[PDB]
Amino acid sequence: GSLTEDGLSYKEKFVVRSYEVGSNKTATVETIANLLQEVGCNHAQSVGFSATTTTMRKLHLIWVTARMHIEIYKYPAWGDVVEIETWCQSEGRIGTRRDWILKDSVTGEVTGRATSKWVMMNQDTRRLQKVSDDVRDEYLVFCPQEPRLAFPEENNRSLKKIPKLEDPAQYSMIGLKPRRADLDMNQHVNNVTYIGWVLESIPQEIVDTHELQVITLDYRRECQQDDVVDSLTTTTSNDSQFLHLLRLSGDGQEINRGTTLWRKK
Amino acid sequence: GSLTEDGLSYKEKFVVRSYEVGSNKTATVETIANLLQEVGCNHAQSVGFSATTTTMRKLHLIWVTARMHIEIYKYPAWGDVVEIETWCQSEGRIGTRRDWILKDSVTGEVTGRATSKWVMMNQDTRRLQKVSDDVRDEYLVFCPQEPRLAFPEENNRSLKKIPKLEDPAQYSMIGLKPRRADLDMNQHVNNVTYIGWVLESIPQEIVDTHELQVITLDYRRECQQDDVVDSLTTTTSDSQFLHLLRLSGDGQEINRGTTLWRKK
Ligand SMILES: O=c1[nH]cnc2c1oc1ccccc12
Ligand SMILES: O=c1[nH]cnc2c1oc1ccccc12
């Protein structure tokens, strides 16, 4: 992996692994999301982070995901080389955005694109806050100044408001718990695990006859290591659309809400 | 990755990923086991198994894991390059063995080693079988003829008999279920998931103050996509544990194992 010529974006190539593919012998959406996370981390390392800046570590502040949106046109086959380009952009005092473009290394064609919204949070109190001027100046030297968006369209799916699923759900997967492989180096549940949990309530027949085209996921609250989650899905629709909800099994506290779009194979 | 000069073994380099490491910022044993599985698949592809042979496909036969044994001296740090060398060997009519050596790419030192025993099984009836002469002949052209073992020591840990844990267990993690990420391309539970499930019943204080040195795992029966598993552990002692995975309902054994941990 390496920063591009202008140093305002980062590229990395990955060879799709045998354990990373599903029944179609192509990468799962969770493998894609793990690769996006990996190239994001390698971008942050290449410009001097550890994604906390000097001022963020001084004030016990971190970046947390608020939303992840992914659109896949072609999932890379086992043994294929996929090239991912990533960049960051400041969105004023609201937060930051990380975008990705996925390409087939052999053809050079765009096979996927993703965008994520990040908010500032105090590590200890867990209180969200706006971005300060000092933090904005610190990361503007690593971001393109003119807008560069993976989803530029006028009324694009990445910015749509997602409603709350009403009980009873059409489908459900109950009692989901994270194991040690689901945790990151800081012992927090990996963001990709939540995508897997959302997909658990999609019926097997949809997975067997459809390919996932779009997934938009809102992150409201974290799942702790000893928490238990319920995954809920309701069909909202050639294409199939679903409305999703992750909540704690006990009190029913919302942790995530989302939507998926699937196309018939 | 590539086959070595003599074509009797295969080497591949891997850069340890951010999501592949634990709290110590080094690779987890599950990341290591996934890498061993990946280099094993790439070895099989390089010698034309695109690991069923021509005779095995005609006879509806497959190789299934009976035992996995792994010993780690140093877990590679995040960003490090680890080089893994793998080879296969026929063990007469019993089955086959796949061995691995893990090295630090920078120093060239051995940081780990692993060995696995594979048995022949009919994919439909699930009945274990001895290896036929035609299959053994087809495998011998890709395996070293003289013995080459990752664990050569006479009377070593990789071949020890493992006893069955007696109830009550000291520790337990109940109601474990596989999700779609736990399945392979054939919709069967990945062998590495069982290692994670065994480790779930180890208390957090052991994980926080010790590093896993050795894991020996016996595979008795498969966990189906809709099965639920209970993970049981009892201290037998360095810290040593005896492990058991069984179905939550009838208590049918799926795995048994042992782990050895060193104080950090
Ligand atoms: O270390 C953390 N403190 C507080 N909140 C979080 C921390 O790591 C996270 C990872 C994902 C989401 C929230 C958090
Ligand atoms: O296709 C299979 N049939 C029967 N037993 C197994 C099959 O795939 C497996 C993968 C791992 C372990 C057992 C099996």
Side-chain angles (χ1 to χ4, degrees):
Chain A
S2 181
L3 286 162
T4 57
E5 199 87 306
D6 65 359
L8 302 178
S9 79
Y10 190 94
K11 289 180 187 171
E12 187 168 359
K13 287 184 233 184
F14 299 96
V15 173
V16 180
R17 305 185 173 164
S18 58
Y19 59 72
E20 285 175 343
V21 307
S23 63
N24 308 126
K25 272 155 210 42
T26 63
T28 68
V29 82
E30 288 182 86
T31 287
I32 302 298
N34 271 329
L35 299 188
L36 301 183
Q37 194 173 252
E38 174 65 2
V39 67
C41 282
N42 289 337
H43 182 199
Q45 265 194 231
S46 74
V47 293
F49 296 131
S50 279
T52 63
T53 90
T54 307
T55 314
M56 297 180 67
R57 299 186 229 95
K58 170 203 184 291
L59 300 170
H60 275 59
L61 301 169
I62 55 169
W63 288 113
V64 318
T65 306
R67 179 180 280 199
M68 171 69 81
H69 176 86
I70 310 173
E71 184 165 19
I72 311 296
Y73 314 123
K74 274 199 195 190
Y75 287 93
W78 162 30
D80 279 11
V81 176
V82 54
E83 188 171 58
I84 312 182
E85 178 180 20
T86 194
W87 68 95
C88 289
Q89 200 143 72
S90 174
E91 286 189 329
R93 291 193 109 106
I94 305 178
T96 50
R97 200 186 75 248
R98 174 170 292 278
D99 285 12
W100 301 256
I101 305 293
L102 289 95
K103 279 179 185 166
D104 179 13
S105 221
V106 187
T107 69
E109 80 188 34
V110 174
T111 55
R113 46 177 189 154
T115 188
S116 67
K117 307 282 220 178
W118 298 76
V119 295
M120 194 99 85
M121 191 182 77
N122 182 284
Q123 225 167 344
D124 306 308
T125 66
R126 290 203 238 221
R127 305 188 93 236
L128 293 197
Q129 61 184 69
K130 295 294 117 176
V131 182
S132 51
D133 284 15
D134 295 315
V135 169
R136 248 159 59 232
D137 299 351
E138 273 185 302
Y139 61 52
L140 263 161
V141 303
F142 312 115
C143 294
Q145 313 268 94
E146 300 157 60
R148 191 195 174 183
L149 347 170
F151 296 88
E153 307 91 30
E154 177 170 355
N155 302 114
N156 73 81
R157 324 181 134 142
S158 78
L159 308 163
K160 205 180 175 173
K161 176 118 128 267
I162 302 162
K164 196 180 187 173
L165 183 148
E166 294 191 352
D167 278 343
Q170 186 175 11
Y171 308 114
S172 75
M173 173 60 74
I174 298 317
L176 295 166
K177 305 193 294 200
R179 54 186 181 92
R180 289 199 199 96
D182 294 302
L183 313 177
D184 63 10
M185 65 190 81
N186 318 133
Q187 287 157 300
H188 286 268
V189 173
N190 190 296
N191 291 331
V192 177
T193 302
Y194 299 93
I195 294 173
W197 288 340
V198 160
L199 297 176
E200 274 301 287
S201 52
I202 290 286
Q204 193 64 52
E205 298 101 324
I206 292 299
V207 176
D208 287 330
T209 68
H210 291 68
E211 275 241 295
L212 180 65
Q213 284 209 281
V214 187
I215 181 169
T216 311
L217 197 56
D218 272 343
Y219 288 76
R220 189 187 203 91
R221 182 172 304 271
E222 258 205 306
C223 171
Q224 311 270 82
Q225 200 181 153
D226 56 354
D227 276 338
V228 179
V229 163
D230 291 352
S231 182
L232 313 158
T233 296
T234 297
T235 312
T236 54
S237 46
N238 196 27
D239 279 6
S240 284
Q241 304 189 47
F242 302 86
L243 178 62
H244 302 278
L245 179 76
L246 298 188
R247 70 189 181 195
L248 295 178
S249 64
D251 62 354
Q253 174 90 77
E254 180 184 343
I255 69 164
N256 294 84
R257 72 174 65 178
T259 55
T260 57
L261 165 68
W262 301 73
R263 161 162 254 106
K264 247 178 65 122
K265 296 166 176 180
Chain B
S2 181
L3 286 161
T4 57
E5 201 86 304
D6 65 359
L8 302 178
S9 78
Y10 190 95
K11 289 179 187 170
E12 187 168 0
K13 287 185 233 184
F14 299 96
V15 173
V16 180
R17 305 184 173 165
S18 58
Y19 60 76
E20 285 175 343
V21 307
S23 16
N24 17 42
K25 272 157 210 195
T26 63
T28 67
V29 82
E30 287 183 86
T31 287
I32 303 298
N34 271 329
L35 299 188
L36 301 183
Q37 194 173 251
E38 174 64 3
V39 68
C41 283
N42 290 337
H43 182 199
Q45 206 140 58
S46 74
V47 295
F49 292 124
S50 176
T52 62
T53 79
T54 66
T55 311
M56 290 167 69
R57 294 191 213 87
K58 110 219 296 181
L59 258 26
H60 276 61
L61 300 168
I62 55 168
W63 289 113
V64 183
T65 307
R67 172 112 144 196
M68 170 69 81
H69 177 86
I70 310 174
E71 293 192 10
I72 310 296
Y73 314 123
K74 274 200 194 189
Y75 287 92
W78 163 30
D80 279 12
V81 176
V82 54
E83 188 171 58
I84 312 182
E85 177 180 20
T86 193
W87 68 94
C88 291
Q89 200 143 71
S90 107
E91 286 189 329
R93 311 268 305 184
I94 306 178
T96 50
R97 200 187 76 248
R98 174 170 292 278
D99 285 12
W100 301 257
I101 305 293
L102 290 96
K103 279 179 185 167
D104 180 13
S105 221
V106 186
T107 69
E109 80 188 33
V110 174
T111 55
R113 45 174 186 165
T115 188
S116 67
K117 307 281 221 178
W118 297 76
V119 295
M120 194 99 85
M121 191 182 76
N122 183 285
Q123 70 198 37
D124 304 307
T125 66
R126 292 206 105 239
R127 305 187 89 235
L128 288 328
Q129 198 168 317
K130 295 219 306 171
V131 184
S132 52
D133 292 8
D134 294 315
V135 169
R136 179 143 40 80
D137 293 341
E138 287 184 275
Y139 242 70
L140 256 294
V141 316
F142 311 114
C143 299
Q145 315 266 300
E146 303 156 62
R148 191 195 175 183
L149 347 172
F151 295 91
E153 316 93 31
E154 224 165 337
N155 266 358
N156 76 272
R157 326 184 134 141
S158 76
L159 310 160
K160 205 181 174 173
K161 174 123 295 280
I162 302 162
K164 197 180 187 172
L165 183 147
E166 296 190 348
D167 277 344
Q170 186 174 12
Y171 308 114
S172 75
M173 172 61 73
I174 77 177
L176 294 165
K177 305 193 294 198
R179 53 186 181 93
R180 289 199 197 97
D182 293 302
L183 314 176
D184 63 11
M185 65 189 80
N186 318 133
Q187 287 157 298
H188 286 269
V189 173
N190 190 295
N191 291 331
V192 178
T193 302
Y194 299 93
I195 294 173
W197 288 340
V198 159
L199 296 176
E200 273 302 286
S201 52
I202 290 286
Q204 194 64 52
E205 51 261 34
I206 293 299
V207 175
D208 286 330
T209 68
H210 292 70
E211 275 235 306
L212 180 65
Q213 171 137 37
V214 186
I215 182 169
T216 311
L217 197 57
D218 272 343
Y219 288 76
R220 189 187 202 90
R221 184 166 307 259
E222 257 205 306
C223 170
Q224 311 269 84
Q225 201 181 152
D226 56 354
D227 276 338
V228 180
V229 163
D230 291 353
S231 181
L232 313 158
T233 296
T234 297
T235 312
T236 54
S237 47
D238 279 7
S239 284
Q240 304 189 47
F241 302 86
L242 178 62
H243 302 278
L244 179 76
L245 298 187
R246 70 188 180 195
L247 295 179
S248 296
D250 61 354
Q252 175 87 245
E253 181 184 343
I254 69 163
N255 294 84
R256 73 174 65 177
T258 56
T259 57
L260 165 67
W261 302 73
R262 64 199 192 256
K263 246 178 66 123
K264 296 167 176 180

